[PDB]
Design a protein around this motif. Structure first.
Motif, PDB file in Angstrom:
ATOM      1  N   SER B  25       1.172  -1.422   0.099  1.00  0.00           N
ATOM      2  CA  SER B  25       0.298  -0.112   0.257  1.00  0.00           C
ATOM      3  C   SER B  25       0.762   1.413  -0.104  1.00  0.00           C
ATOM      4  O   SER B  25       1.924   1.053   0.379  1.00  0.00           O
ATOM      5  CB  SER B  25      -0.502  -0.046   1.225  1.00  0.00           C
ATOM      6  N   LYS B  48       2.075   7.107   2.093  1.00  0.00           N
ATOM      7  CA  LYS B  48       0.239   7.142   2.562  1.00  0.00           C
ATOM      8  C   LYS B  48       0.107   7.665   0.918  1.00  0.00           C
ATOM      9  O   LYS B  48      -0.063   8.608   0.443  1.00  0.00           O
ATOM     10  CB  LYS B  48      -0.405   7.347   3.895  1.00  0.00           C
ATOM     11  N   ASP B  49      -1.399   6.502   0.573  1.00  0.00           N
ATOM     12  CA  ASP B  49      -2.083   7.087  -0.591  1.00  0.00           C
ATOM     13  C   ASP B  49      -2.263   8.540  -0.160  1.00  0.00           C
ATOM     14  O   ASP B  49      -3.861   8.008   0.909  1.00  0.00           O
ATOM     15  CB  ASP B  49      -3.031   5.323  -0.811  1.00  0.00           C
ATOM     16  N   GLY B  51      -5.784  10.817  -0.147  1.00  0.00           N
ATOM     17  CA  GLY B  51      -6.695  10.853  -0.177  1.00  0.00           C
ATOM     18  C   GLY B  51      -7.384   9.953   1.242  1.00  0.00           C
ATOM     19  O   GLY B  51      -7.021   9.305   1.432  1.00  0.00           O
ATOM     20  N   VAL B  53      -8.402   7.443   2.355  1.00  0.00           N
ATOM     21  CA  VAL B  53      -8.251   5.458   1.888  1.00  0.00           C
ATOM     22  C   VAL B  53      -8.136   5.146   3.468  1.00  0.00           C
ATOM     23  O   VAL B  53      -6.627   5.874   3.553  1.00  0.00           O
ATOM     24  CB  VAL B  53      -7.572   5.113   0.378  1.00  0.00           C
ATOM     25  N   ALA B  54      -8.843   4.134   3.512  1.00  0.00           N
ATOM     26  CA  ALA B  54      -7.906   3.497   4.878  1.00  0.00           C
ATOM     27  C   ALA B  54      -6.755   2.502   4.330  1.00  0.00           C
ATOM     28  O   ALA B  54      -6.455   2.039   4.653  1.00  0.00           O
ATOM     29  CB  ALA B  54      -8.667   2.859   6.018  1.00  0.00           C
ATOM     30  N   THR B  55      -5.359   3.281   4.652  1.00  0.00           N
ATOM     31  CA  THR B  55      -4.496   2.596   3.875  1.00  0.00           C
ATOM     32  C   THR B  55      -3.289   3.325   4.527  1.00  0.00           C
ATOM     33  O   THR B  55      -3.482   4.203   5.001  1.00  0.00           O
ATOM     34  CB  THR B  55      -4.068   2.359   2.050  1.00  0.00           C
TER      35      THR B  55
ATOM     36  N   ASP C  80      -8.643   7.042 -12.571  1.00  0.00           N
ATOM     37  CA  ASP C  80      -8.776   6.123 -11.470  1.00  0.00           C
ATOM     38  C   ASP C  80      -8.323   5.252 -11.544  1.00  0.00           C
ATOM     39  O   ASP C  80      -8.004   4.182 -12.179  1.00  0.00           O
ATOM     40  CB  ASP C  80     -10.021   6.348 -11.865  1.00  0.00           C
ATOM     41  N   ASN C  82      -8.420   3.296  -8.986  1.00  0.00           N
ATOM     42  CA  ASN C  82      -8.450   1.909  -9.107  1.00  0.00           C
ATOM     43  C   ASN C  82      -9.549   0.775 -10.133  1.00  0.00           C
ATOM     44  O   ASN C  82      -9.285  -0.393 -10.037  1.00  0.00           O
ATOM     45  CB  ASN C  82     -10.615   2.041  -7.985  1.00  0.00           C
TER      46      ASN C  82
END
Lengths: 148, 148, 148, 148, 175
Positions: B25, B48-49, B51, B53-55, C80, C82
């Motif tokens: 991640s 950390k990514d 945004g 985002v839970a990461t 995106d 994702n």
């Protein structure tokens, strides 16, 4: 808003060595410095873990002096001063002993030095004397002199 | 609000060519320094990514010493310290091993080193001895000496 | 927030002349350097387009080396992550070739290296070799060496 | 918000004298420099200030050469992009020829170099030649090499 | 460095107190303190009691001849209705205690600036009792009118302190 800067002068005549930095609470933004020889002061910092957490930089880091002893140095800067209070201590553990949870407990419950801006004194033994101080502020600054 | 800054010593006597940096991640704002010559330092970083985002920023990267072995070095700063926790590790791997899901998988599930801001050491073997640390905060610093 | 910095080192024994930078999407801010001479590193950047529209930054630019062919490079930092994902590639086309939709499709549907922050390699042919890497961040970087 | 930078050099071996800067929509914050002679370069700026202006910097400026003819250089960075796009071109007109609405239309409906961020060449005639580029950015740039 | 450090004795001015004020940051109640040691004996800080408030800078220890120590104190952070009233002690080579105090209350309506400098025989820990003695003895106001007194142990204080909540205390301890 809790944090603590720490500076430990090493007049022991022998190079120290970092071991670890246990934290009952809080964390640090800087690594534990490895080598802090004679005529040199270790500079370290800890701070309350970032976020809405009702906890302070309650920490204790050991240190291996050239005399083969643990330089267990604690400091408690609780988020709450209404119930809890500022404290610190410096007690040498002979031989080898990491900055354990039990090491921090011994430092904080044996004879912790009050955080009242006072230059409290004790003799650690092994031909080793301590001249230390820390503030009663929420953002504490600690000065230690570990000499012989 | 979470990142890792890695600094790795190079005393092994041979430049480590960067292979890759697999991120389970997170990403890296800095390219992996291809050449980290002897008696020198690598100054890497992980982020950390961005945004909501839970990461976290967990990544095992690989370097190739002149001895001809992958220096898979891992780290991890999970987003949810409530469940997971900081974990860093470093293990030598024979030949060119591209760090990947398997590399990070074994390093995190092998003999990982706790992020108690403690200096944990283990002889990497192949004539290499490791000496490193990782903080318990969202920000995590590494000073990983790899000596021979 | 999508961006990419691309730096190509020209040690091919001859300078390169900028040709074009097609953008399937996205937009750049700096023009292609005219001539990158021997043993000099190119500097360039692309970014997200001039507005908040749900599309990434995908672009392929070409140069003309002193060897008389076209060094095309392609990068793709999407919007995106994702669905889409980071990618990049670099290849040599014999003779003069303009960068366009077709050249980007060729470089992006051939063997486009992942942006996993990995120092990928290739033999570009015509006595030319590539040694490149790019990050997986939205604000990714890219470092490429082109050696004869 | 579409500002454009313009930089056009002169390698013709003679002095360069400013003629005029026709602006149908938007006013460049600066005025046209007068002296940019041989082995010197010119700098300029765009026009998307003064708030409520829809189409920006879509006009041309004329610069007088020592040869007695004048070169009109256009640039067009409209706010619209579904109906319009980046555009630019250069032409040389014998004798006196001022930049104006007719000049802008003539430059725009001759061989207008598409603003695909591609280096474009043309023999300007009259012992003159041009290598120019303009980014497809709303925050566009431009570089013009006017060599005899 | 700048706050809680030692400079030349003649260099102790109002401007350095302003610099210490700046270093402490923007707080409502605060005080910069600077004491010059003309006694000829190197000083050693003992402790810094606080009836209220705290300090962000440690208390400097060694204040040799022709040198002036500095110090910073600030109100407790937050909406707590508290001021910055404190005192601290030093140990001279003469073997006695040089206690000083300074009180900048948060609420000027019912209280005002106060300060005092005294010598206590032998080693005395600056504490609640020493602060109470200094505050309810012969405390000086913040009128900035130069206050002079002998310390009762062969020394005299040439000190002064402002009445503003941003107090700037200066002292010239001399024989």
């Amino acid at each position: 808003s809790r944090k603590i800067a720490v500076g430990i002068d090493n007049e022991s005549g022998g190079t120290w060595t970092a071991l670890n930095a246990y934290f009952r609470s809080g964390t640090t933004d800087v690594i534990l410095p490895e080598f802090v020889p004679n005529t040199k002061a270790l500079l370290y910092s800890g701070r309350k873990d970032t976020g809405p957490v009702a906890t302070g930089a309650v920490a204790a880091f050991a240190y291996y002096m050239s005399s083969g002893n643990t330089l267990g140095v604690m400091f408690s800067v609780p988020f709450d001063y209404n119930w809890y209070s500022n404290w610190w201590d410096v007690k040498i553990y002979s031989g080898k002993r990491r900055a354990d949870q039990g090491m921090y407990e011994d430092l904080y419950y044996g004879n912790p030095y009050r955080g009242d801006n006072g230059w409290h004194e004790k003799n650690l033994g092994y031909g080793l004397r301590m001249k230390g101080i820390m503030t009663s502020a929420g953002e504490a600054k600690m000065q230690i002199k570990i000499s012989r």
